[PDB]
Amino acid sequence: QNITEEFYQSTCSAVSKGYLGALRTGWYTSVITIELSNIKENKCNGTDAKVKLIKQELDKYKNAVTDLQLLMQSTPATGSGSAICSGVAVCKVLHLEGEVNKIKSALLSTNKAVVSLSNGVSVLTFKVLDLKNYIDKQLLPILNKQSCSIPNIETVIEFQQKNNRLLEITREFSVNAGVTTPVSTYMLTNSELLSLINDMPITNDQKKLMSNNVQIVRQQSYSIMCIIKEEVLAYVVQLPLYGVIDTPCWKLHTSPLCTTNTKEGSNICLTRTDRGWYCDNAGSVSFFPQAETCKVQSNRVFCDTMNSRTLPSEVNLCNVDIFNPKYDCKIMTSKTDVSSSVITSLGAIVSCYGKTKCTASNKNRGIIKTFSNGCDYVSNKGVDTVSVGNTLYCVNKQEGQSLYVKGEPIINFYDPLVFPSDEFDASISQVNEKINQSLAFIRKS
Amino acid sequence: QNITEEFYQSTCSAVSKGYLGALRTGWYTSVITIELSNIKENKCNGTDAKVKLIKQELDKYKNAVTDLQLLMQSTPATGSGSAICSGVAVCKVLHLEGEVNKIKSALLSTNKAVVSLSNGVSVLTFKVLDLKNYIDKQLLPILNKQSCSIPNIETVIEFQQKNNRLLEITREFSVNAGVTTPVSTYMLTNSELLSLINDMPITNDQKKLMSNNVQIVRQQSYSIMCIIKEEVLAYVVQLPLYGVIDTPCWKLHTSPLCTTNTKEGSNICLTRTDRGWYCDNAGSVSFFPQAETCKVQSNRVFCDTMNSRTLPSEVNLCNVDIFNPKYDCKIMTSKTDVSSSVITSLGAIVSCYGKTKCTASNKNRGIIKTFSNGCDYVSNKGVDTVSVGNTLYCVNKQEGQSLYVKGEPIINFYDPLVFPSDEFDASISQVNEKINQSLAFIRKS
Amino acid sequence: QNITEEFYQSTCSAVSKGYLGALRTGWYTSVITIELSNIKENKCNGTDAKVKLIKQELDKYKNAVTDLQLLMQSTPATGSGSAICSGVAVCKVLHLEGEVNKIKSALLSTNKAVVSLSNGVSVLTFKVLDLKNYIDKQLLPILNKQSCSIPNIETVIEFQQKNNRLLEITREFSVNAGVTTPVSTYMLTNSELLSLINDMPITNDQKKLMSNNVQIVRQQSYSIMCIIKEEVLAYVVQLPLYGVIDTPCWKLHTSPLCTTNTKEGSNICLTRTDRGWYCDNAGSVSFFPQAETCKVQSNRVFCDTMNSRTLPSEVNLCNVDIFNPKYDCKIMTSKTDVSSSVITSLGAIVSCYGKTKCTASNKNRGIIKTFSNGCDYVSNKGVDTVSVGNTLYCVNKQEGQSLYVKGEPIINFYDPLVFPSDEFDASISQVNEKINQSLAFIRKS
Numbered sequence A, B, C: 001q002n003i004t005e006e007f008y009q010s011t012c013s014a015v016s017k018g019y020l021g022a023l024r025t026g027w028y029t030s031v032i033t034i035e036l037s038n039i040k041e042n043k044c045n046g047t048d049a050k051v052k053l054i055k056q057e058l059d060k061y062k063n064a065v066t067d068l069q070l071l072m073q074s075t076p077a078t079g080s081g082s083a084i085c086s087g088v089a090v091c092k093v094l095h096l097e098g099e100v101n102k103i104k105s106a107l108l109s110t111n112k113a114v115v116s117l118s119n120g121v122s123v124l125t126f127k128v129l130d131l132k133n134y135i136d137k138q139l140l141p142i143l144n145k146q147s148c149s150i151p152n153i154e155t156v157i158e159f160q161q162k163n164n165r166l167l168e169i170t171r172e173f174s175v176n177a178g179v180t181t182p183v184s185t186y187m188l189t190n191s192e193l194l195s196l197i198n199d200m201p202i203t204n205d206q207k208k209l210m211s212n213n214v215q216i217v218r219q220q221s222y223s224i225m226c227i228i229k230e231e232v233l234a235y236v237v238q239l240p241l242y243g244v245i246d247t248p249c250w251k252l253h254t255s256p257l258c259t260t261n262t263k264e265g266s267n268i269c270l271t272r273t274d275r276g277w278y279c280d281n282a283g284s285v286s287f288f289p290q291a292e293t294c295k296v297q298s299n300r301v302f303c304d305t306m307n308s309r310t311l312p313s314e315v316n317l318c319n320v321d322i323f324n325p326k327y328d329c330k331i332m333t334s335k336t337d338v339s340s341s342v343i344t345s346l347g348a349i350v351s352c353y354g355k356t357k358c359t360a361s362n363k364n365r366g367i368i369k370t371f372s373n374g375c376d377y378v379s380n381k382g383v384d385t386v387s388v389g390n391t392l393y394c395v396n397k398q399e400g401q402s403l404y405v406k407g408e409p410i411i412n413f414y415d416p417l418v419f420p421s422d423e424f425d426a427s428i429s430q431v432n433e434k435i436n437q438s439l440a441f442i443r444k445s
């Protein structure tokens, strides 16, 4: 909806509100079949280039099938095994005797058909390529003789077009140990993907969402290779199910908050930790530390709960009351006062220290704000770039309202001498108790 | 052989035993040649589309050769230079005058031939593509006249098939600064790779291993571009030699071990460090911290010693006796009691703290175990998924025996007040001495 | 110029001097247009394979245009937005009404033309592909009838060659959300890149530099997709401008510096931090912590200031005087004495501790130096490999002069008992004051 921002001068942090989240909570698997031709090598009298070209392209069909066969005899484990158990279970059903015969019967007349497997999964099966029809009708009557018949150059070219998708799928499945991500258009065409989305047991408001963000759907999908058996090549595409739709999502941005003394070695720093995406999820907050686990389309966010952290909903109160022991508001400390900048959703946080020249300029007006020593913030309204030292950042031109929450920087509440300057993932209340215990050691003496 | 597991309740860690390791200790280089045609651009009377198509494809042959030439005038350094010295030394020999003339003579009649270079290396050379034969026989008599002769569409298509492998190799060598990894099927076909494996100075038991794991061999190989000189395109493929075969390998899994007090801010945590693959290697243990440096095929492990750490064999005794100062059993400490789970080889470790809902469910039975506060473990026998908060993990369905080693969690042996909660790569005996020194400061006062 | 090295025995660090740097400080954008044909699907009497092949390839042209259209309706945000503001601003100008009509007029007769946009940018526009000319002249008179005319197989093949570049560009723009990097030869051919370099407002000495390192230029460039409007496909290529040329650049290499006591648990370690590339830049030093932000061609370095840190020029004095509080010479401390090696530009630093077998061998001479416990260094003159434990490193064979700066290891100046063994990003003067404060706590008692 409306993207807004709030910069907290007290903690040198910003929160971008107003995002609508789509959290993946389930998987929808689908079987993709390719009708193959069970043929063995045949040698006949061949000389003219058209016979050679067909036999050359026919061998690329042969090596592609054998490459997929030795891939399933020994399949190397992948780091995606903890996320593909839903689709891997489907490949084990197809390897059972008689199960490939079922999908082979349902896809006898149409491209799409629903198939009830022997494991209780009513999966939707597609036949995206038919090589048995082309080889047995156009190639076998030409090559299964004493001397090879002469094929036309149209047949040589038409067969290279059909065989191409098989070769490209074997290429991806071989280099990725049968589990590929994202799902390419070779694994599933955009036309096939939209038709697959439409047939999903999801709401009409949810089908419009996945259809407008098909590239994000591909990046959050898996393609799993199953088995080759009885002239059938089958592989499972594992598509995301977003059980959480239109949930509030905020992104926390943090920057170092140091003191501004004039002698280096006499300054202490403080920075909020656990920056990233926070979204309401099932009575708690799902935090996403990794940056690539949430795809954004500027109004919206698409996250995967596979790489998330479950936090109490009180964690959002660290932005308004950080000194409350009721919520573990975590920080890191040091004595490294180096200047930096963070480009937020509607502006930029600037931490300027030392002799560094920090500024924000407009392309046609020039320098419109020069930052002093400390932590500050600037809106994107009228600002194009932000320069910190010899580094120039670009400000996001997204429309929205920024709110500057003025307040005393909390680093000024700390006596420098007894400060813990080597804390990593420490809570605010944790550090204060460590300071109260270290001050008693000076009180008695 | 038999994959087994041992979960240590005292240290919240699991060790997966029974893996057979294959550690790379050497390199076997091989020269791959492509016979090129030394031709310059020729212009003749051309109009019909077949002459244009040949000249268009002929220019793609020309720009591909010139692109490889300017790549060798200035070749950017790569991060693989510390691992390709064996193959880079071979390219420098070919750049010597008269050395390319030798391999050009040995490959005069056959595709494969052994060549003794001028540096003491008896390397095996392959001729995988012959473009000089096709250009000089089928194209030059057509184009080296006053007016161009009319080539058939079979020639136009047959030349695009042969020229394709050259264009794809130049594409990989250009984007990767002459050093590509893994070695694609364009650099070396599966047929050429198996034939190359067979001719290696390794045991017959070792040839069967590399032939059943060709994809892992590709991922642990390098393709290095040499020189283009005297109508010859040569590049070295650097293949792995596994001097260590069938060595015991165990994978250590660790999870946070915290106390279970009811007031947050009064709990301390502890976690074993240096998780990853450990393998016996030459009287010591080779530890692999990076996750991608060891490829697994579920019975076996394929690691590269390039990114390994050499540890004394006593490091394995940290799983049975962690408090022994004879071996530096390292841990990290904090006060961050956040729930998490780790999917092991035969089960899952669960560290549950706070209000987090941790559970393990079966697809048809439902919740079969609910974890309480602390660190626990569950077998894969009967378990399909593990849920921690809003995150659901998939359990590996590998067959094996798990062993639950009961014991008091070592975190209970620590007084919370004087605990060091900010140690990173500290030893157990190191921390205890720091606690004995900090307790004396309270003893005197 | 001349690459030299200096190893500091006192700090276990090496500095490789003599590199000439090229720091990117600006962007030069250019518009790349592809003339498309505004056609809708037409159905006529078609049977022979040539009509089917044209209509099949024509649909791949249709889906490629529609895929680029739905990509611009909703474009996912990328992590490169902070570096593509220069090029993104150009795409917004083309989306204005009447602006695409201007470039469409300038490119009416030639491939290249300068166009003054409605935002003050005098950009250079290229027309690299003309599909409207081929479709409207060779395909529309064949297909826009009652029954389809029979096209020759030369037309079917000639159209697959022209349409291929469009399909490959749509593939890259779709998987990368309209912002691709590096810029492939499909986005911009080597012939087009060199011509684009030549027309740049840079010095003749600067054009020779970019032309000899086109692959590095591609890796530091961006390709941004603009809009499809009025039979024109336009996208911006953002090329680097190196405002800093021939600047001195040094690379700092660090290795752990531990004590050599015989009882483990009684040793302390120390390591300089902030290793990487340092270059003089505008009166300060630009430090590059990330390894991939600087491309090297062995004489030269090509860095991007987008991911850099601005430090005072006094930071170089940490190599000759580390104990001076005037510059924050930062270190990290621990008690982890594990052996390791670092391959430098002209040699190798070796930190050998414990029972580890550290050595440096020559291929024909064997072991030429055996390292003892502590930190040492070896030149590349006569050395081929360096072995530490079960790990073998390769030494860079670059020509240059090494200088061994002898000195007492600074770790011996520290009393082990009161040492801070858990400091991360701490300054030398910071740690010494923490030791002076901890010794007073023992002085009074």
Ligand SMILES: *[C@@H]1O[C@H](CO)[C@@H](O)[C@H](O)[C@H]1NC(C)=O
Pocket (backbone or CB within 6 Å): A001, A002
């Ligand atoms: C967003 O802001 C506009 C004002 O520009 C307001 O009219 C609208 O109601 C806001 N949307 C929501 C969901 O509050």
Ligand SMILES: *[C@@H]1O[C@H](CO)[C@@H](O)[C@H](O)[C@H]1NC(C)=O
Pocket (backbone or CB within 6 Å): A045
């Ligand atoms: C064609 O086949 C015959 C056998 O039917 C064989 O004798 C002859 O050599 C073949 N022609 C070739 C191989 O060119």
Ligand SMILES: *[C@@H]1O[C@H](CO)[C@@H](O)[C@H](O)[C@H]1NC(C)=O
Pocket (backbone or CB within 6 Å): B001, B002
């Ligand atoms: C593996 O376990 C089986 C029991 O299922 C046993 O018969 C076999 O000997 C074991 N293998 C080894 C190498 O001990």
Ligand SMILES: *[C@@H]1O[C@H](CO)[C@@H](O)[C@H](O)[C@H]1NC(C)=O
Pocket (backbone or CB within 6 Å): B045
């Ligand atoms: C063909 O070649 C002749 C010279 O031999 C030249 O005069 C003529 O223009 C050419 N035809 C073209 C270029 O179409």
Ligand SMILES: *[C@@H]1O[C@H](CO)[C@@H](O)[C@H](O)[C@H]1NC(C)=O
Pocket (backbone or CB within 6 Å): C001, C002
């Ligand atoms: C590099 O070293 C050579 C000596 O081998 C010397 O002649 C030359 O002047 C040096 N270059 C520079 C720029 O100092």
Ligand SMILES: *[C@@H]1O[C@H](CO)[C@@H](O)[C@H](O)[C@H]1NC(C)=O
Pocket (backbone or CB within 6 Å): C045
């Ligand atoms: C050819 O077109 C005619 C109409 O003009 C139509 O009746 C006929 O069925 C077509 N032939 C086909 C579709 O094979």
Ligand SMILES: [Zn+2]
Pocket (backbone or CB within 6 Å): A035, A108, A130, A132, A133
């Ligand atoms: Zn069929």
Ligand SMILES: [Zn+2]
Pocket (backbone or CB within 6 Å): A252, A253, A254, A275, A342, A343, A344
């Ligand atoms: Zn951020």
Ligand SMILES: [Zn+2]
Pocket (backbone or CB within 6 Å): B035, B108, B130, B132, B133
């Ligand atoms: Zn030959």
Ligand SMILES: [Zn+2]
Pocket (backbone or CB within 6 Å): B252, B253, B254, B275, B342, B343, B344
């Ligand atoms: Zn693990």
Ligand SMILES: [Zn+2]
Pocket (backbone or CB within 6 Å): C035, C108, C130, C132, C133
């Ligand atoms: Zn035109």
Ligand SMILES: [Zn+2]
Pocket (backbone or CB within 6 Å): C252, C253, C254, C275, C342, C343, C344
């Ligand atoms: Zn280095």
